[PDB]
Design a protein around this ligand. Structure first.
Ligand SMILES: Cc1cc2nc3c(=O)[nH]c(=O)nc-3n(C[C@H](O)[C@H](O)[C@H](O)COP(=O)(O)OP(=O)(O)OC[C@H]3O[C@@H](n4cnc5c(N)ncnc54)[C@H](O)[C@@H]3O)c2cc1C
Ligand SMILES: Cc1cc2nc3c(=O)[nH]c(=O)nc-3n(C[C@H](O)[C@H](O)[C@H](O)COP(=O)(O)O)c2cc1C
Ligand SMILES: Cc1cc2nc3c(=O)[nH]c(=O)nc-3n(C[C@H](O)[C@H](O)[C@H](O)CO)c2cc1C
Ligand code: FES
Ligand code: FES
Ligand SMILES: [Ca+2]
Lengths: 204, 198, 408, 257, 446, 387
């Protein structure tokens, strides 16, 4: 079937249609390796948080629900960070400056609020995985352009030889700043809504 | 006095939470259509930050700091969960305040009201305060100034989007994509303070 | 080990203190008192209701339910209520169905109002008088190729108080119906056999309600009659299940019992001296028959009026004896009928083509003052759009155009 | 809400049970894995010391074997630049900077700033080419969040910064904190003098790019003003009298023999 | 005294001599359906019907009770209808002298008459259509009242007649109309004028207010902005001085007074002057043998806000007191946008023409440019003397933001209040249509 | 073809409605007037770039070395071939020719590429091409160093035209300054070609600081022309005998051009006066406060006026009506903000020697907010029925 893991990639993208993961999309997308690691972390954390929130969704009072959800999310992220620091030290060094951004990524909390609080556990897990895939689509597309045009590299591998290295390419210094990410996301949304006219916002 | 004025100006302009540091972007891009809605959300964010930074200052300095309670005990692995718990309780109270007294703003916010908890600027401000080792008074001033800068940013974006009623934007860009472009141009404008030390 | 105990105890205490602080001032911002929701308004006759609910749900519980059609979400917009004290703001979703002038009077959507404090309503006395009946089926004859004629009677000699153009809601339970169980005479079953319509079936899981219009006028004492079309799946999608409510009503036979909810007021004829023009097509014959019979017989109005009916073929026309008798009795009524696509076996001579074209070419083109007369409308959506375009080109105003979009 | 979730008893039980479970799991993970995290950090520090020295290594076993063989830590008194007694391998200069009420610097003798303290005894690493001391690695640090690096000089000192320079701990903005993630920037340090004929600090972080072939000049960080300034302040201080000045004077004079 | 500083007096050629002459003989008159805002007619006549003076021709569906009567006695010859059968004009051929007669009173009883009696007489005569409401510039509902009736006794329009010359011939009728208005108001009567002397009403609730300055100092919207600001809760009625003379004549003699004095002026008029005519007169018959040869445009009203009088519209409008004639400008000029411009008028100083003071121009109907988007060089603020933000309001009108426009002051305005903004616009926007669309929306949703 | 006829002729249309008479002014007239007002600055800029380059070249090289330098640069040997000379006794004709060899390719590139983008967007959205791109292109071509690469000029004009204007609907429909957005794109993308000490004089192998960089180092006593050995005077900076961006150097020429369009009513004297007020106030406050380590504190307002791109920005780029405030009080506030921001970036930001393009782009973000404040006061006045 697999009709649920693929909807939030193009039809219900968390960044292009919902506005839910923007800050890290601006932060981590200068390198494809960092974007890939962040994609995996967000997808894993959202899946597990959705599962655990749906497991106890019928016992959560409405006046402590934010506290319950955030306690679960923060505990998961902290445990993952400790495990990475103990067993995957290099990956941990990659994600160390961004660990606190994973907790406040609006995708995790928004999917727990919108879906997990009213859905079944396995569907909530699948929803988390699919929204992570849609997040990673945008992250990898933006990081491709940013890394290639700002450093002539893809995943750290030399693609465009630089003038300082005896090559011909002069890196673009605006690709190492946030405005380039803003513009790339805007043009990506333009293309997506050109191919999906149903997502065009009404003139009224 | 000059110390706190310098800190306040730095928090508002030199280290603006939105057009520097690029934090709290989701509601900044979504809820900037109307100046008055943005103004109310900015007031709410100011209040939350101004209570959050000093309370987490006290909690860190009395409980979570190394050797704060018992010699040889850290408890600093609980920082993030404690900080987010404080913010979550505050937004829980703010939700019923807005439901009782400000129904228009409560309805305009929608699903973004409970997501004020994970507005990245508030958690980032608490973290910056702990990194910089502020005092209680410095925490109060810093949380207030960071909120003020974020509100100034969103109100300016709402003013531009209101002037853009005369624009003719292509349909694929109408709304979100053009707002992304607008925020990028705003960041360009704010790069005027990049190398000043305040 | 010591640091683990300290961590768990301290974190648990911090969370407990925060939650206690939340519960305090949850007790102060969220009221738990009673509500004086004055449903009757002037006599402050209220209902005891727990807060946090919805206005339409409380109304349904108290039994003075309003004309709801979709259960919430702001889609239908038919749950109109008037509030003069209560919720201090109107939801923007309501503005899609509420104008500024309406909101100034106090109109609101019952499915969007949140029960938070005391309020008073000004529902019309018609709502206070609505009540429920269980009817007896007299006959369920077939009048056209896809059209039925259901007739009901209210027991104990009572007659429902209704006006021409009004409608009722009929309740149905959960029931699985097979298309082969219907009864259709030999004249109208030729197309059914040709298209093999009997192989379908319908299933109902939970009870549903639908709105329907009467085909009689108040002088028909104790008898409620209706015109219902079969909800056959579209030919372009043969693999779609057919309709539920229409199939259930079709399955009704003579002698069975049915349960109606009461008359509702809509699509009335304004009492002026202007000429009336009734344009109907397809299954929209019931409101036209009600209006025309009411006008000619009950109040015996002398206003000039006429009826224009557009059918598909000669087999689908009915009530011809009634219309001819009305025309012969009263010289102020003249009616004409047209067929969109007559069959060769029909041997028809007369008006053909679309009814709006026939009306424009025969009556409205040479009319002195088309704008000075009133138009009543019931038929397919495409025919509705066509006649509206024609009348607007003739210069007729919206206030003089009345229609009920029952859906062909 | 639902059932009896609004009940005070239900709310308190739910939150207390969740807090117990979450804090137990978090605390067990944090306290259990501390030793492994510390070992990983120590191994990463022995690496990048090997890397700055130019000794190629990969894997924990190879790194540890090449250490304790090619490198021997030593203590330095800073004030006089004379060697101090042993136990160099297990010295914590970062902690000694705070404890023992060690030297606190006047606001006029700062530069790198946000250090506010100074260990009276530092640690240096001498890389051995068999039995002789070929050159020495100097740890220096300065502000810009908190930036720690490994400066590399030869036995001549004034005339060669050897094999380059590495940052082993920083938290600057990615895409603008490219002082480590770009080996091109790190390669520009090879052959720089650190001093002039007058024997005073001369390293300059040239804004806009240093001229080709210039001595004492290394390109700044594009779009990273105040981080280039922190890097400049680090060397301004640690090459001065309050830093490795006396030690580097003893070197080039006979300290390393 | 109120002095207006921001504004413009258009230095167009062909100013009239302020001396009244007898005009041509008129054989056809009309009532124009489209010049009454929000009006849907109900015909009471048919082609070939004989009519009297003050006999009802049609009625308003949207304003019950309001009657539109015949200026003259004669026969109905045309009922012209446009797209979607919109009533364009009802043309009557003059013949005979039959009329409908009403009650007459003495001069000293007019100020004490009953408001219901005054309303009944005005509505039956058809003179009620002389009043317009602010907001929305509509004929008042016949059961409504106003606390402010504004009399327009001045004219700042280009090539306009001098109200003093007209009033001084009809002083008794002007004062009688003022007395009737004082009885009708229930608030005050505002006689807005220039500094020169006019006949005066002795009633204490009739006040004279002097306005000084260029156009639009003589506009009723300017007067209301400065004396009685209008909104949804405060509504004023306006009426011009010739209609006040007509009201006085009606209540003094019992007969409908349909004589008008208009100016026939413009760059192609041989002898610009004031002429005596009748309400709704044929402009083709009036400007016969008065115009230089060539292609011209006849306007009912002024060059700023008037109606192009061609075909079924070639008749004097109800609220118009002048006829303008000027040439049609269709030539294509090579580099005409870049010439020094000694004979080019502008409110900017980018042409040589402003250096010659007292120059008059033979202006034509050319648009001196193409349609473009608004680049705000500050022209709107030069000609707009009311307390508004004109650029922001005009951008509201362009974008279709009716709520924002109503906040910014669109309810206080008529189409004639934005004519100078249309004039000085470099992008060639027509703002009166945008204002009317906004006002129609506001009224429909109101 | 239709392209030439539309620009050369007047449309020949009549009014359809409303005001049957119109003003003579139109957008084409407005734009061409602003375009012609920078011609004195452009001619002085070409002549000055040529003269600066010739002075530096003859300072550096001599004889056969100078001949070899000339033979290896197409600008130099084209100036020699067309009749000029690269010698120290060169005239104003030689200097203007050498400066034209630098300005004309930049301007041609910018005009062609930006016009391509405008024509594409107008064809797709089915509108007529308007003016405004003339002003945008000539201003962008005048605000760059003489040595700028042509591919970088193309990228900058592309960013400014597409990202700042066309995506918002074109002329009249945006909020940000397009030419300054393109300049900012260049500034943050390729700093080595639009800043530093190798970029502002077009002499091969010549290194020189310019006046704002020299004052930041040593005050008024550091202002020396190293190509000629002379001290830079206030009259030199006012007349324009200094290096920098092509069309910025002559405050006198910019003032002559600005007087005409201010008198015409095209540029806003309220904006210009606000800029002057903000500049004077902030610089005088810095002068009164003083500093022992920052020499930028003791620069007076009249030295602020003649250095950098301040006069160019104030007279031609802050006066852009579409990017500014739409009210008079807002215009005063908008100008004051620009002036304060420029002096502030000049003095207390050591990353940048100038702050004019950043200052105007910053104020573009706040112009709608000033208008909003003014309009809310107006709305309150209305609700009170005025008096
Ligand atoms: C005031 C009022 C008066 C009315 N009066 C009349 C009247 O007098 N006579 C009359 O005939 N109608 C009338 N109507 C129309 C009314 O909607 C009828 O109930 C109509 O017959 C609807 O048919 P139904 O409810 O049996 O089937 P519906 O529930 O409307 O469904 C039938 C349609 O839905 C499709 N469908 C069914 N199940 C599915 C599925 N699972 N997935 C997808 N598609 C599906 C079918 O193929 C078919 O197209 C009136 C409506 C109103 C509001
Ligand atoms: C309108 C305009 C705006 C400018 N803005 C800046 C700026 O913001 N930052 C900058 O470094 N240079 C800017 N410049 C370039 C400098 O003003 C100047 O030409 C160059 O820096 C010469 O160096 P100087 O500052 O020493 O005179 C601008 C130039 C112009 C014409
Ligand atoms: C006085 C004046 C100044 C202008 N200044 C600029 C400018 O600095 N930059 C620019 O790109 N366009 C400028 N323009 C052109 C035009 O107004 C601008 O590109 C708009 O922003 C286009 O919508 C100017 C126009 C005028 C009339
Ligand atoms: S991810 Fe930062 S606010 Fe949404
Ligand atoms: S039930 Fe649908 S609008 Fe109320
Ligand atoms: Ca130390």
């Amino acid at each position: 079937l697999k009709k649920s893991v693929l909807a939030p990639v193009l039809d219900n993208n968390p960044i292009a249609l919902q506005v839910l993961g923007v800050c890290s999309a601006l932060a981590v997308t200068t390198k494809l390796e960092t974007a890939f690691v962040m994609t995996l972390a967000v997808m894993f954390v959202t899946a597990l948080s959705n599962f655990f929130v749906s497991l106890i969704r019928n016992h959560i009072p409405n006046s402590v629900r934010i506290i319950v959800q955030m306690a679960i999310i923060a505990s998961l992220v902290i445990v993952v960070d400790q495990i990475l620091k103990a067993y995957l030290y290099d990956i941990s060094k990659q994600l160390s400056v961004f660990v606190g951004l994973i907790i406040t990524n609006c995708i995790v909390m928004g999917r727990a609020e919108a879906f997990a609080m009213k859905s079944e556990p396995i569907p909530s897990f699948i929803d988390g995985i699919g929204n992570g895939l849609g997040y990673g689509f945008v992250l990898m597309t933006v990081g491709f352009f940013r890394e290639l045009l700002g450093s002539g590299k893809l995943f750290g591998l030399e693609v465009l030889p630089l003038i300082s290295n005896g090559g011909w390419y002069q890196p673009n210094g605006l690709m190492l700043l946030a405005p380039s990410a803003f513009f790339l996301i805007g043009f990506m949304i333009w293309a997506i809504r050109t191919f999906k006219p149903e997502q065009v916002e009404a003139k009224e | 006095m000059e110390h706190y004025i310098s800190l306040l100006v730095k928090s508002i302009f030199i280290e603006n939470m939105a057009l520097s540091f690029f934090l709290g972007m989701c509601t900044f891009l979504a809820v900037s259509k109307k100046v008055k809605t943005s103004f109310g959300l900015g007031i709410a964010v100011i209040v939350v930050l101004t209570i959050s930074v000093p309370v987490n200052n006290l909690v860190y300095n009395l409980v979570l700091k190394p050797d704060a309670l018992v010699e040889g005990v850290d408890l600093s692995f609980l920082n993030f969960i404690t900080f987010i718990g404080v913010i979550a309780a505050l937004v829980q109270i703010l939700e019923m305040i807005l439901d009782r007294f400000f129904p228009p703003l409560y309805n305009a916010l929608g699903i973004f009201l409970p997501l004020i908890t994970v507005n990245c600027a508030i958690f980032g401000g608490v973290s910056f305060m702990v990194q910089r080792d502020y005092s209680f008074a410095e925490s109060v001033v810093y949380g207030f100034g960071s909120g003020v800068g974020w509100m100034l940013a969103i109100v300016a974006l709402a003013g531009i989007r209101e002037k853009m009623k005369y624009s003719d934007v292509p349909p694929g860009l109408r709304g979100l994509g053009i707002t992304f472009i607008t925020a990028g141009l705003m960041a360009l404008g704010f790069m005027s303070f990049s190398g000043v030390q305040l | 080990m010591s640091t683990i105990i300290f961590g768990v105890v301290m974190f648990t205490l911090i969370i407990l203190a925060l939650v206690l602080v939340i519960l305090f001032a949850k007790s102060k911002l969220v009221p738990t008192g009673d509500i004086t929701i004055s449903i009757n308004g002037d006599p402050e006759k209220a209902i005891v209701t727990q807060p946090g609910g919805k206005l339409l749900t409380a109304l349904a519980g108290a039994g003075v339910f309003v004309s709801s059609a979709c259960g919430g979400g702001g889609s239908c917009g038919q749950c109109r209520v008037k509030i003069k004290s209560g919720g201090g703001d109107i939801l923007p979703t309501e503005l899609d169905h509420i104008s500024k002038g309406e909101a100034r009077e106090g109109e609101r959507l019952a499915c969007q109002v949140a029960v938070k404090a005391d309020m008073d309503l000004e529902l019309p006395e018609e709502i206070f008088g609505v009540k429920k009946w269980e009817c007896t089926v007299i006959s369920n004859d077939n009048k056209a190729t896809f059209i039925k004629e259901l007739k009901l009677a209210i027991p104990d000699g009572e007659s429902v108080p209704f006006r021409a153009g009004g409608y009722i809601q009929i309740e149905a339970p959960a029931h699985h119906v097979k298309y082969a169980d219907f009864d259709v005479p030999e004249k109208y079953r030729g197309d059914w056999d040709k298209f093999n319509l009997f192989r379908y079936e319908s299933k109902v899981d939970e009870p549903i309600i639908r709105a329907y219009s009467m085909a009689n006028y108040p002088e028909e004492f104790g008898i409620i009659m209706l015109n219902v079309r079969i909800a056959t799946p579209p030919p372009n999608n043969p693999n779609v299940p057919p309709g539920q409510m229409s199939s259930y009503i079709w399955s009704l036979k003579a002698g069975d019992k049915c349960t109606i909810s009461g008359p509702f007021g809509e699509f009335f004829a304004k009492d002026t001296d202007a000429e009336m023009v009734f344009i109907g097509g397809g299954a929209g014959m019931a409101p036209m028959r009600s209006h025309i019979f009411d006008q000619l017989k009950r109040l015996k109005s002398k206003r000039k009026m006429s009826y224009w009916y557009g059918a598909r073929s000669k087999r689908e026309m009915f009530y011809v004896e009634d219309f001819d008798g009305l025309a012969a009795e009263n010289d102020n009524f003249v009616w004409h009928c047209a067929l969109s696509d007559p069959q060769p076996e029909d041997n028809w001579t007369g008006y053909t083509g679309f009814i709006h074209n026939v009306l424009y070419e025969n009556y409205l083109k040479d009319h002195e003052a088309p704008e000075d007369c009133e138009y009543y409308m019931c038929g397919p959506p495409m025919m509705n759009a066509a006649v509206i375009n024609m009348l607007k080109n003739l210069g007729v105003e919206e206030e003089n155009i009345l229609l009920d979009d029952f859906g062909g | 809400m639902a059932s009896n979730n609004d009940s005070i008893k239900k709310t308190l039980f739910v939150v207390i049970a969740l807090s117990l479970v979450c804090s137990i799991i978090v605390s067990a993970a944090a306290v259990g894995l501390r030793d492994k995290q510390k070992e990983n950090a120590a191994l990463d520090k022995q690496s990048k010391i090997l890397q700055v020295a130019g000794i190629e290594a990969k894997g924990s076993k190879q790194i540890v074997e090449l250490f304790n063989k090619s490198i021997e830590p030593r203590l330095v008194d800073f004030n006089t630049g004379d060697f101090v007694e042993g136990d160099a391998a297990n010295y914590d200069q970062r902690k000694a900077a705070k404890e023992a009420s060690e030297s606190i610097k006047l606001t006029a003798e700062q530069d790198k700033a946000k250090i506010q303290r100074r260990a009276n005894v530092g640690v240096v690493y001498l890389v051995k080419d068999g039995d002789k001391t070929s050159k020495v690695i100097l740890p220096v640090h300065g502000n810009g969040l908190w930036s720690m690096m490994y400066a590399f000089v030869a036995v001549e000192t004034d005339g060669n910064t050897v094999s380059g320079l590495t940052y082993y701990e920083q938290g600057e903005t990615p895409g603008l904190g490219g002082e480590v993630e770009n080996p091109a920037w790190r390669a520009q340090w090879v052959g720089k003098k650190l001093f002039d004929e007058n024997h005073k600090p001369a390293i300059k972080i040239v804004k806009g790019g240093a001229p080709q072939g210039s001595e004492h000049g290394v390109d700044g960080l594009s779009g990273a003003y105040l981080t280039s300034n922190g890097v400049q302040n680090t060397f301004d201080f640690w090459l001065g009298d309050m830093g490795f000045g006396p030690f580097l004077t003893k070197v080039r004079d006979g300290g390393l023999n | 005294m109120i002095t207006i500083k921001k504004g413009l007096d258009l230095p167009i050629a062909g100013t009239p001599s302020q001396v009244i002459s007898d005009g041509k003989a008129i054989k056809k008159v009309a009532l124009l359906g489209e010049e009454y805002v929000g009006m849907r007619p109900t015909m009471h006549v048919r082609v070939g019907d004989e009519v009297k003076k003050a006999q009802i021709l049609f009625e308003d569906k949207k304003n019950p009770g309001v009657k539109f009567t015949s200026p003259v006695s004669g026969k109905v010859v045309e009922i012209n209808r446009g797209a979607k059968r919109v009533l364009q004009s009802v043309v009557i051929e003059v013949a005979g002298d039959d009329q409908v007669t009403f009650d007459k009173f003495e001069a000293n009883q007019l100020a004490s008459l009953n408001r219901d009696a005054i309303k009944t007489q005005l509505v039956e005569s058809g003179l009620w259509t002389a009043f317009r409401t602010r907001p929305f510039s509509k004929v008042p509902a016949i059961d409504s009242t106003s606390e402010a009736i504004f009399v327009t006794a001045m004219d700042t329009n280009p090539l306009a007649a001098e109200p003093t010359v007209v009033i001084n011939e009809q002083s008794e009728a002007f004062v009688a109309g003022l007395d009737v208005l004082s009885a009708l108001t229930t608030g005050k009567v505002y006689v807005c004028k220039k500094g020169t002397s006019l006949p005066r009403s002795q009633q204490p609730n009739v006040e004279e207010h002097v306005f000084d300055g260029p156009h639009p100092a003589g506009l009723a919207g300017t007067h209301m902005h400065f004396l009685y600001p209008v909104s949804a809760d405060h509504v004023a009625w306006s009426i011009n001085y010739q209609d006040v003379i007509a009201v006085g004549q009606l209540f003094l003699t019992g007969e409908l007074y349909t004589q008008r004095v208009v100016s026939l002026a413009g760059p192609v008029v041989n002898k610009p002057r004031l002429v005596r005519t009748v309400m709704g007169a044929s402009l083709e018959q009036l400007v016969d043998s008065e115009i230089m040869p060539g292609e011209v445009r006849i306007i009912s009203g002024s060059v700023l806000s008037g109606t192009k009088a061609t075909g079924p519209h070639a008749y004097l409008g109800r609220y118009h007191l002048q006829v303008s004639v000027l040439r049609e400008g269709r030539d294509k000029e090579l580099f005409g946008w870049a010439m020094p411009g000694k004979n080019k008028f502008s409110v900017t100083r980018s042409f040589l023409g402003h250096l010659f003071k007292g120059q008059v121009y033979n202006m034509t109907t050319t648009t001196n440019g193409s349609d473009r988007s608004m680049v705000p060089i500050g022209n709107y603020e030069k000609v707009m003397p009311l307390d508004m933000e004109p650029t922001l309001l005009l951008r509201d009108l362009c974008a279709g933001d009716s709520d924002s426009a109503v906040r910014l002051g669109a309810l206080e305005l008529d189409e004639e209040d934005l004519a100078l903004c249309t004039f000085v616009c470099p992008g060639k926007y027509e703002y009166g249509q945008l204002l009317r669309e906004c006002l129609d929306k506001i009224e429909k949703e109101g | 073809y239709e392209a030439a006829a539309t620009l050369f002729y007047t449309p020949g249309l009549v009014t359809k409605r409303s005001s049957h008479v119109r003003d003579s002014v139109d957008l084409k007239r407005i734009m061409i007037m602003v375009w012609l007002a920078v011609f004195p600055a452009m001619f002085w800029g070409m002549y000055n770039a040529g003269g600066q380059a010739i002075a530096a070249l003859n300072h550096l090289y001599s004889g056969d070395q100078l001949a070899a330098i000339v033979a290896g640069n197409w600008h130099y040997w084209l100036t020699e071939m067309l009749g000029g000379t690269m010698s120290s006794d060169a005239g104003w004709g030689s200097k203007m020719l050498l400066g034209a060899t630098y300005f004309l390719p930049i301007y041609a590139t910018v005009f062609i590429v930006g016009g391509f983008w405008e024509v594409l967007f107008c064809m797709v959205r089915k509108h007529e091409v308007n003016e405004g791109f003339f002003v945008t292109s000539i201003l962008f071509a005048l605000i760059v160093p003489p040595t700028l690469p042509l591919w970088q000029a193309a990228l900058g004009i592309t960013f400014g035209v597409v990202v700042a204007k066309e995506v918002f609907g074109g002329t009249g429909r945006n909020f940000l300054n397009p030419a300054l957005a393109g300049r900012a794109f260049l500034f943050f993308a390729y700093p080595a070609q639009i800043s530093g000490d190798l970029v502002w004089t077009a002499a091969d192998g010549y290194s020189g600081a310019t006046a704002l960089s020299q004052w930041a180092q040593g005050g008024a006593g550091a202002l020396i022309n190293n190509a000629t050995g002379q001290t830079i005077t206030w009259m030199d900076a006012f007349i324009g005998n200094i290096p920098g961006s092509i069309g910025e150097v002559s405050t006198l020429a910019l003032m002559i051009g600005a007087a005409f369009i201010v008198y015409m009513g095209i540029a806003s004297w309220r904006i210009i006066g606000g800029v002057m007020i903000g500049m004077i106030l902030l610089s005088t406050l810095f002068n009164v406060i003083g500093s022992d380590t920052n020499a930028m504190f003791n620069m007076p307002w009249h030295w602020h006026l003649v250095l950098g791109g301040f006069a160019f920005g104030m007279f031609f780029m802050a006066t852009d009506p579409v990017s500014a405030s739409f009210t008079n009080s807002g215009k005063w506030a908008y100008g004051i903000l620009i002036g304060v921001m420029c002096v502030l970036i000049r003095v207390v930001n050591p990353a940048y020697p100038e702050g004019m393009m950043l200052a105007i782009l910053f104020a573009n973000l706040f112009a709608p907010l000033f208008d909003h404040v003014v309009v809310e006061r107006n709305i309150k006045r209305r609700l009170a029925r005025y008096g």
